[PDB]
Ligand binder design. Structure first.
Ligand SMILES: [Cl-]
Ligand SMILES: [Cl-]
Ligand SMILES: [Cl-]
Ligand SMILES: [Cl-]
Ligand SMILES: [Cl-]
Ligand SMILES: [Cl-]
Ligand SMILES: [Cl-]
Ligand SMILES: [Cl-]
Ligand SMILES: [Cl-]
Ligand SMILES: [Cl-]
Ligand SMILES: [Cl-]
Ligand SMILES: [Cl-]
Ligand SMILES: [Cl-]
Ligand SMILES: [Cl-]
Ligand SMILES: [Cl-]
Ligand SMILES: [Cl-]
Ligand SMILES: [Cl-]
Ligand SMILES: [Cl-]
Ligand SMILES: [Cl-]
Ligand SMILES: [Cl-]
Ligand SMILES: [Cl-]
Ligand SMILES: [Cl-]
Ligand SMILES: [Cl-]
Ligand SMILES: [Cl-]
Ligand SMILES: [Cl-]
Ligand SMILES: [Cl-]
Ligand SMILES: [Cl-]
Ligand SMILES: [Cl-]
Ligand SMILES: [Cl-]
Ligand SMILES: [Cl-]
Ligand SMILES: [Cl-]
Ligand SMILES: [Cl-]
Ligand SMILES: [Cl-]
Ligand SMILES: [Cl-]
Ligand SMILES: [Cl-]
Ligand SMILES: [Cl-]
Ligand SMILES: [Cl-]
Ligand SMILES: [Cl-]
Ligand SMILES: [Cl-]
Ligand SMILES: [Cl-]
Ligand SMILES: [Mg+2]
Ligand SMILES: [Mg+2]
Ligand SMILES: [Mg+2]
Ligand SMILES: [Mg+2]
Ligand SMILES: [Mg+2]
Ligand SMILES: [Mg+2]
Ligand SMILES: [Mg+2]
Ligand SMILES: [Mg+2]
Ligand SMILES: [Mg+2]
Ligand SMILES: [Mg+2]
Ligand SMILES: [Mg+2]
Ligand SMILES: [Mg+2]
Ligand SMILES: [Mg+2]
Ligand SMILES: [Mg+2]
Ligand SMILES: [Mg+2]
Ligand SMILES: [Mg+2]
Ligand SMILES: [Mg+2]
Ligand SMILES: [Mg+2]
Ligand SMILES: [Mg+2]
Ligand SMILES: [Mg+2]
Ligand SMILES: [Mg+2]
Ligand SMILES: [Mg+2]
Ligand SMILES: [Mg+2]
Ligand SMILES: [Mg+2]
Ligand SMILES: [Mg+2]
Ligand SMILES: [Mg+2]
Ligand SMILES: [Mg+2]
Ligand SMILES: [Mg+2]
Ligand SMILES: [Mg+2]
Ligand SMILES: [Mg+2]
Ligand SMILES: [Mg+2]
Ligand SMILES: [Mg+2]
Ligand SMILES: [Mg+2]
Ligand SMILES: [Mg+2]
Ligand SMILES: [Mg+2]
Ligand SMILES: [Mg+2]
Ligand SMILES: [Mg+2]
Ligand SMILES: [Mg+2]
Ligand SMILES: [Mg+2]
Ligand SMILES: [Mg+2]
Ligand SMILES: [Mg+2]
Ligand SMILES: [Mg+2]
Lengths: 174, 174, 174, 174
């Protein structure tokens, strides 16, 4: 038993390792979307940079779980980071639809981890999830939903001028 | 009944007074460790100052419970602050082992108070403990565990040079 | 064929994707070493931070290959990022020995990619490797070799005081 | 023989003069595109300025070959600068397609000069091309490819609003 460990269930320790892996998986998916929008035959550089920044934030989310695991006296166990589900992402609308689903998958895993922490009476882990993960997920889901609504209004997938304008006006200039 | 009181169970009020006392007890134990490491025949001044600062922080933790009690309309009831369990603390390793156990005793009391607040459906008290006490405890337990690991690596209790080096490099220069 | 593609052999495109994967693998190994040295029962925080920074630099190396692939008109193809070879890294000497071998594995792959680029008469890819990767590898191998020499001089693995001193004096304060 | 000449083959000297001429030809073509987009019946001033700046950069590329020739002890020999292939450039898409082909013609000549320098065992000339010309060509080809992809998305040649928007958002405001 780690000398620091107190009120930290083995099941929560394992679930934190699985959550860590899912954050790395989400990072890698966003890396793939960055590389796709940087292609010469796609060439939507502000969209590409949005996904690159998301990739970096998800890696930071994973590192924060590593630090958390060690603070509680659990032991980080790593698994392979699976490659993303697609090699090419169609267009900005298809990519944003995939991002929305990814963010809701990550959110569901965080909510499931909160349920487990509640069941094991771990208020520190509950607070960590509520204070560091759950609100950022709601905000990032809302942002992507707003983007999808605007891509549909702009006539995606058919309206190339609409796609061009989204990249200029909806995502930060990079 | 206090005019401000709302959703504040008598049992939680009493448990806050007991928690207040335990914070003052923890403060006093750290005061004792400060005075020990300041002795001419101990003379580890950065270690002494680490414990002095901890003593001040635990007193602040107690004062925050006094303020909390009054905000909720409970009534502060003080009891004697018991003297520490030891008059002398051996060496840096023995003192840090005692500090780890003290921090885990305080943490267990905070977790038990959270259980009571949960049972009495007091989300304000739950939030107060999660936001003001529980993460600071996990961080301070991790810090002391890290110190104990390093004191063991440095050959305590036998290796006086190791003890000297810990005071120079592991705790803040004071 | 990509409209930008010129003098870019399919074999080099594929080898760049494999090199990208190896950089991500190296990043992940360094992440594992960071988490290990951050454990409460290891607690060498400057060593941990050295490996964390290396993890970030290797991820940047991977991203630079993604950008390169797209500049040449190749297509990024991602594969799983395999978990590191170990779950625990022993001590600073064992970890640095593993880091030296990892850096020489990455260097050999870069040298093999340079051989392929030379065979396919691709001076742009040769210059990219020489200007962005090969000297950084020689410098980072030299740094790790110097560290191993010093860890041996400090009596690793047995001399815990030597290990403590390496973390204070050989790696940057973090 | 020039007193400075060392390891500089007559064939490389002649090929540097031909490359100089091609840079001046590329400059002149971009000058023509500037003047076309500045016409009152074309009037895409940011596109015009993009091509004007490219014209200046290609002239600088030529001057750098003149300086190189003299540094090695070769003798600059100038030939006529041929007028561009067209007197009018259609629209932004046709001009960018012509620019892509021009940049790939210049790139092929630079790669052919690198082959010759390699055959004549001239590492100074190889380094000069790799360090001063080949990466700038890959970057400028990628930029023009990205532009063509966006002009197609914006509905060129038929979509005049798309052409107008490209000039406002894709090229620098001038
Ligand atoms: Cl536990
Ligand atoms: Cl408990
Ligand atoms: Cl358990
Ligand atoms: Cl696990
Ligand atoms: Cl699997
Ligand atoms: Cl796919
Ligand atoms: Cl998903
Ligand atoms: Cl949050
Ligand atoms: Cl449409
Ligand atoms: Cl607009
Ligand atoms: Cl605007
Ligand atoms: Cl009440
Ligand atoms: Cl109520
Ligand atoms: Cl009551
Ligand atoms: Cl009481
Ligand atoms: Cl008593
Ligand atoms: Cl005693
Ligand atoms: Cl205790
Ligand atoms: Cl806290
Ligand atoms: Cl000893
Ligand atoms: Cl020292
Ligand atoms: Cl020092
Ligand atoms: Cl090719
Ligand atoms: Cl070629
Ligand atoms: Cl090929
Ligand atoms: Cl591949
Ligand atoms: Cl495999
Ligand atoms: Cl292992
Ligand atoms: Cl290896
Ligand atoms: Cl380098
Ligand atoms: Cl020893
Ligand atoms: Cl010569
Ligand atoms: Cl020679
Ligand atoms: Cl000659
Ligand atoms: Cl000539
Ligand atoms: Cl002629
Ligand atoms: Cl014409
Ligand atoms: Cl041409
Ligand atoms: Cl260059
Ligand atoms: Cl149209
Ligand atoms: Mg132990
Ligand atoms: Mg377990
Ligand atoms: Mg999973
Ligand atoms: Mg995340
Ligand atoms: Mg698979
Ligand atoms: Mg919050
Ligand atoms: Mg954010
Ligand atoms: Mg996000
Ligand atoms: Mg918004
Ligand atoms: Mg369309
Ligand atoms: Mg009253
Ligand atoms: Mg009462
Ligand atoms: Mg008590
Ligand atoms: Mg306290
Ligand atoms: Mg007594
Ligand atoms: Mg907090
Ligand atoms: Mg603190
Ligand atoms: Mg404390
Ligand atoms: Mg620390
Ligand atoms: Mg001794
Ligand atoms: Mg095409
Ligand atoms: Mg191929
Ligand atoms: Mg591989
Ligand atoms: Mg690398
Ligand atoms: Mg495996
Ligand atoms: Mg070379
Ligand atoms: Mg070079
Ligand atoms: Mg260099
Ligand atoms: Mg460096
Ligand atoms: Mg490195
Ligand atoms: Mg050095
Ligand atoms: Mg030993
Ligand atoms: Mg002479
Ligand atoms: Mg001659
Ligand atoms: Mg010519
Ligand atoms: Mg040129
Ligand atoms: Mg003629
Ligand atoms: Mg360069
Ligand atoms: Mg430039
Ligand atoms: Mg150019
Ligand atoms: Mg660009
Ligand atoms: Mg029209």
């Amino acid at each position: 038993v780690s000398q620091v460990r107190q009120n930290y269930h083995s099941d929560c320790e394992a679930a934190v390792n699985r959550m860590l892996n899912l954050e790395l998986y989400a990072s890698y998916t966003y890396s793939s979307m960055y590389a796709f929008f940087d292609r010469d035959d796609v060439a939507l550089h502000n969209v590409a940079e949005f996904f690159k920044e998301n990739s970096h934030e998800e890696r930071e989310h994973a590192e924060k779980f590593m630090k958390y695991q060690n603070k509680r006296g659990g032991r980080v166990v790593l698994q392979d980071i699976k490659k993303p589900e697609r090699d090419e992402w169609g267009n900005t609308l298809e990519a944003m639809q995939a991002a929305l689903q990814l963010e809701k998958t990550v959110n569901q895993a965080l909510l499931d981890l909160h349920k487990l922490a509640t069941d094991k009476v771990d208020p520190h882990l509950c607070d960590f999830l509520e204070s560091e993960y759950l609100e950022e997920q709601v905000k990032d889901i809302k942002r992507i939903g707003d983007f999808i609504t605007n891509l549909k209004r702009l006539g995606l997938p058919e309206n190339g001028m609409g796609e061009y304008l989204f990249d200029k006006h909806s995502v930060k200039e990079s």
